[PDB]
Write a protein that binds this ligand. Sequence first.
Ligand code: AKG
Ligand code: NI
Ligand code: ZN
Lengths: 345, 4
Amino acid sequence: SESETLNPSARIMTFYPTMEEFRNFSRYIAYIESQGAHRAGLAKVVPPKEWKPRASYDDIDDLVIPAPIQQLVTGQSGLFTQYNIQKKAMTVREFRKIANSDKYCTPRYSEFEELERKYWKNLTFNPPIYGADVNGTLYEKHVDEWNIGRLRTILDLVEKESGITIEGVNTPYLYFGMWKTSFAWHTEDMDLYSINYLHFGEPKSWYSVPPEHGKRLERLAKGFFPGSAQSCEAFLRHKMTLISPLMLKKYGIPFDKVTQEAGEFMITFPYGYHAGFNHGFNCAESTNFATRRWIEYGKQAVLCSCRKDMVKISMDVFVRKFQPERYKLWKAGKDNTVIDHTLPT
Amino acid sequence: ARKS
Ligand SMILES: O=C(O)CCC(=O)C(=O)O
Ligand code: NI
Ligand SMILES: [Zn+2]
């Protein structure tokens, strides 16, 4: 099998497109999948040096972060639950001051390995504030390449057919980080792809588990949190669960890590579990997207069952348009298709 | 409804 030979270790791959390769987003995503990048659950794409989404970020000090969250973390021994305390609205200027203040700034460190140890040692102390989930873009209007606010993928069929906007999913979110702000282990809503561009500032570090091993992570998590498992069918979707790399190693869960620098894109793939943290004051922009290969994942995504506010996209339009043979079978509950996580298209 |  040809797909199984490509990226056989399911390691996170990094790509450096030329400007010509970079122009067609859906085409380039298809290309990186032809190289087996999706097997990692995460890939880095470094755009051409001549490409820029914005002239300068010197005009954003007055941008409002309406719902900053203070991240209270509880736990020990590589297993943590993160609780989100919402604080009052603040401006980017008010946030950056806090971020760089003696109290909240990045500790001194030699190599990333040292900073990673400090993260895992200190994450339950000095709860940081994350300027997360801010509706908006920092891309200039004319930018046609990899524009997070208009990628033109088949995810556009949701709004097209129903008028439905789902904030952060088919619209962009901004994330202003400071040292030790975290994103818990999760896959995307409806097991979609995501794109994450780090506009400026200190790095954002990522952990990823191959989609091929996602079920093994779930089994571990359900074992570490039996109470949460009984309460909800997909408790990781609460995005509250933090698990250290040492804990993953101890239980033989394959994973990889990568550090995203300012100017770089991360792509997450359907059913690719990821988690991470910010190094210091930074700003990221992200949204979800889809490809034809997502459709089966969307059909089989296991959704949070204890909240009537979680994200649920109707699959009907995608199955009708892109799987006409199987529509009647699926509607009658008899579509037993098995996902091969290695395969492209 | 929205991503969080
Ligand atoms: O940057 C963040 O805070 C969240 C990033 C994320 O969840 C993703 O990119 O899928
Ligand atoms: Ni994500
Ligand atoms: Zn739930």
